[PDB]
Amino acid sequence: KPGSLTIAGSGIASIGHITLETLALIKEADKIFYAVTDPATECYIQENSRGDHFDLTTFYDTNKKRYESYVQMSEVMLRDVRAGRNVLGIFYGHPGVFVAPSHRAIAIAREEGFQAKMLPGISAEDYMFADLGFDPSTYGCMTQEATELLVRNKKLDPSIHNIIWQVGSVGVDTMVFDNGKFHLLVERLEKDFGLDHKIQHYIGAILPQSVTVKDTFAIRDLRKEEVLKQFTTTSTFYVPPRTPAPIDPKAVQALGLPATVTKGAQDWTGFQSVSPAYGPDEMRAVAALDSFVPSQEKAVVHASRAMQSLMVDLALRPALLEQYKADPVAFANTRNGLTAQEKFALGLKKPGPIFVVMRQLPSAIASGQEPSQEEIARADLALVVVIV
Amino acid sequence: KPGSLTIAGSGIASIGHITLETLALIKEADKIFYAVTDPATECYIQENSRGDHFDLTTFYDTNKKRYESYVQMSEVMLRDVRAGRNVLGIFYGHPGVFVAPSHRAIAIAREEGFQAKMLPGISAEDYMFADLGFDPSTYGCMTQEATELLVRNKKLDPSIHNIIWQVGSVGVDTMVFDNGKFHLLVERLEKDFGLDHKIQHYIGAILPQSVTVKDTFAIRDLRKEEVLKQFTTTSTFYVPPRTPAPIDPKAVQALGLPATVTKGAQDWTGFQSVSPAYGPDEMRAVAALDSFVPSQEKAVVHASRAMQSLMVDLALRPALLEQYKADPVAFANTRNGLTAQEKFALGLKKPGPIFVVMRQLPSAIASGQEPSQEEIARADLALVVVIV
Ligand SMILES: Nc1ncnc2c1ncn2[C@@H]1O[C@H](CSCC[C@H](N)C(=O)O)[C@@H](O)[C@H]1O
Ligand SMILES: Nc1ncnc2c1ncn2[C@@H]1O[C@H](CSCC[C@H](N)C(=O)O)[C@@H](O)[C@H]1O
């Protein structure tokens, strides 16, 4: 059935945050509908495109319900899908994070029997973790829209990370943003954290000329006229925990961990107790570094030019991927530079075989010993945090 | 000071999730340290690089404490920074989401007086929103590590979206993952949601050959051996809201939102109440679409080639960006194809002026009328969800 919908993101920073798969799609799509934040990104999308594009932000108006705009945004995309075009929608950031028309359009398209897919993009929260230098895993991390939090009369949990989005549009359902209802959010913060607790006002840099906003304010300061001025439709708040929960010695014991575990994963922001970088355990790990030899030989990458070229192709060329998926043995036959082993692996169209052929022990490489057909066919994640 | 540290991500999907700014850095960096999850991504990094690289995953071992490995990963990067090198670190996904050695290395580099920066990447949660088709904003969304949730004796809130990471490594501090403590997570889920509530087991597709895992299980099912065994170190759980909180009519009033609005921003997954795609409100919006005319004239993109060329350069070339920030007036003067207005705006090194010169009203464009020096000098976001 002709016609498809792909919805992707542009990320937050101008141009730089765009993913490789997304740039590829921009170049090939029949038509692009976009809602982005800065003119350099907008121009970049247009100029890389096939030249058939539409600015979704043209459906906004000062006193018009945003919900009405969103329905219309979804609809113009669906019309072109119905017309049998390959439609790309692009929203700034991640197209599925605090975005109504994307999920709406995908669901309707699928219901009408078209293929539809969302691609992830770089969100404002992703930008925040990088710029503010915290990890959501350290205490756990709650994401909420400011108006959503208030309309459902939710409380904020002061023991975890909190991120509050759209703080500049509390209670606003049109396009007039005057901060008239901001005080309601301040009242919530006061109740949950008190007046002395500090929050972080975050605006990630959109242009090269932008500088990151990461100002700290005590909750009591959020009433000052000069502070209030700074909160825009772009503003996000980070609220660090006031009262991180203590380790439960009973749970530690039940998990089979050492009782001498006094610590969780380190937070480096300076909002909590800042433990020295090179304590005894760190000193010991550093001292052991040069000497460390793994218990078993580790594999290294070992792939033909043909294998690597194909694997890049499948990542970046959706037309080639569709053909490979339809008929992998036929597809792999196309690429005669492939070793026997690689051709066999690709035919199976399974992930495990790929790892066996593209990664080999140095010992086996030196010997010239290749993986057996059996080793290939039978086959099948680095954890980079420990809360303990 | 000679020596810098930049830490970036590779995203989750092989190659396609890498950001444009990250590829640029791979090409230019003196030295790359990486921890990635697939050999195509690994090869791609190597082949785009200047050929000085190091596999951080060399520091793991079966019965070695992961924390020791992480200290060592940070340290090898810091050694090269201290040596005066421009170092790039790359971790799969987002390098600051559930990653200990990145935030550590950045903090230490900064404290020692070196320039250090984290760039965002596509996280597993980013992948999940796109794949599972939900928006964290609709009910709020809590992110947590499985072991952390247990060791701090946290309760899960059944009124919001919940995402639980590292479910396949409960209580494990080394590199042996047997799921021997996974039952502890099941007990927690049982207490908070009961036995009949359904969760989704998510594994985003890493290779072209991978297929997305998005299986639904009742909490009851999680104790079965053939189910339990499916949960690997790559697994994440999505736990949809069981009892979403009602829209409080009094909060609706206080917020200045339309009365008796009962309908919060729509979730399309199927886990929440079925709701017509084309109810009367949506139909009215669709009918109004074709004749919609905005109340005032909207600006459009309007910039010289020189402006667009420079703005792309600044997004993708850190060397040029540094020179620009050092002397913006002198830098702008070197691009003689800029309009006089563009040269002035750029020389201010402020974001507001850029918007003034790069977006102009069609009426003014037709006149050749440009923004004034005064308009540019005094210069100072599309919201894409509304929770009702
Ligand atoms: N540059 C920026 N810095 C900080 N927060 C930002 C931001 N741009 C957008 N946001 C956040 O996103 C809200 C708009 S909703 C759209 C978010 C976008 N889809 C994303 O993935 O990030 C803003 O009100 C704010 O809370
Ligand atoms: N392909 C994948 N699908 C789903 N979850 C994944 C995943 N890869 C990693 N994860 C999640 O991430 C955990 C590893 S911690 C590292 C996460 C990475 N920095 C990121 O930004 O996503 C896993 O235990 C799992 O919960």
Tab-separated table of C-alpha atoms and ligand atoms in Angstrom, chain A residues 11-13 37 91-99 121-128 131 144-145 163-169 201-206 213 232-237, chain B residues 126 137 381-385, ligand 1:
chain	number	residue	atom	x	y	z
A	11	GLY	CA	17.310	17.864	18.464
A	12	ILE	CA	17.790	21.071	20.439
A	13	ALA	CA	21.076	22.627	19.298
A	37	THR	CA	12.966	26.505	16.677
A	91	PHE	CA	9.883	18.250	15.284
A	92	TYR	CA	12.614	19.903	17.328
A	93	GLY	CA	14.170	17.821	20.089
A	94	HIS	CA	12.718	14.295	20.239
A	95	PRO	CA	9.474	14.237	18.155
A	96	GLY	CA	7.674	12.097	20.769
A	97	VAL	CA	8.626	13.990	23.947
A	98	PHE	CA	6.049	16.672	24.870
A	99	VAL	CA	4.577	16.492	21.328
A	121	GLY	CA	15.878	12.629	18.627
A	122	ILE	CA	17.877	14.555	21.251
A	123	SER	CA	15.466	15.881	23.898
A	124	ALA	CA	15.775	18.912	26.188
A	125	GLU	CA	16.239	16.399	29.044
A	126	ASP	CA	19.133	14.763	27.145
A	127	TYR	CA	20.679	18.235	26.733
A	128	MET	CA	20.074	18.917	30.436
A	131	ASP	CA	24.910	20.503	30.454
A	144	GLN	CA	6.492	16.253	34.429
A	145	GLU	CA	4.784	19.083	32.561
A	163	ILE	CA	12.556	17.905	35.929
A	164	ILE	CA	9.652	20.307	35.317
A	165	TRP	CA	8.944	21.273	31.697
A	166	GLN	CA	6.903	24.142	30.191
A	167	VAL	CA	7.255	26.215	33.394
A	168	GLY	CA	6.737	29.346	31.229
A	169	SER	CA	3.233	28.372	30.082
A	201	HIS	CA	16.811	27.225	35.600
A	202	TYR	CA	17.951	25.529	32.388
A	203	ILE	CA	17.955	26.775	28.808
A	204	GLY	CA	20.184	24.684	26.561
A	205	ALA	CA	22.024	26.672	23.843
A	206	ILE	CA	20.089	26.652	20.547
A	213	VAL	CA	21.523	29.091	30.942
A	232	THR	CA	10.279	31.794	28.943
A	233	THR	CA	8.492	29.154	26.847
A	234	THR	CA	11.936	27.542	26.480
A	235	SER	CA	12.645	27.288	30.261
A	236	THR	CA	12.962	23.910	32.045
A	237	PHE	CA	13.557	23.541	35.802
B	126	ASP	CA	14.519	8.049	23.758
B	137	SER	CA	4.387	14.216	29.451
B	381	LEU	CA	9.499	28.680	20.994
B	382	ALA	CA	6.688	26.602	19.442
B	383	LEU	CA	4.957	24.660	22.288
B	384	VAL	CA	3.870	21.301	20.778
B	385	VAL	CA	1.699	19.781	23.581
C	1	LIG	N1	16.592	24.867	24.674
C	1	LIG	C1	15.881	24.342	25.669
C	1	LIG	N2	16.412	24.302	26.918
C	1	LIG	C2	15.667	23.790	27.913
C	1	LIG	N3	14.443	23.259	27.856
C	1	LIG	C3	13.965	23.275	26.601
C	1	LIG	C4	14.601	23.787	25.490
C	1	LIG	N4	13.801	23.651	24.367
C	1	LIG	C5	12.710	23.081	24.810
C	1	LIG	N5	12.742	22.821	26.156
C	1	LIG	C6	11.689	22.217	26.963
C	1	LIG	O1	10.709	21.655	26.115
C	1	LIG	C7	9.460	22.379	26.267
C	1	LIG	C8	8.753	22.441	24.935
C	1	LIG	S1	7.887	20.884	24.594
C	1	LIG	C9	8.857	20.170	23.232
C	1	LIG	C10	10.116	19.420	23.719
C	1	LIG	C11	10.959	18.749	22.618
C	1	LIG	N6	10.151	17.781	21.832
C	1	LIG	C12	12.115	17.974	23.272
C	1	LIG	O2	12.359	16.791	22.988
C	1	LIG	O3	12.821	18.518	24.107
C	1	LIG	C13	9.884	23.724	26.848
C	1	LIG	O4	8.826	24.394	27.515
C	1	LIG	C14	10.980	23.264	27.817
C	1	LIG	O5	10.533	22.729	29.043
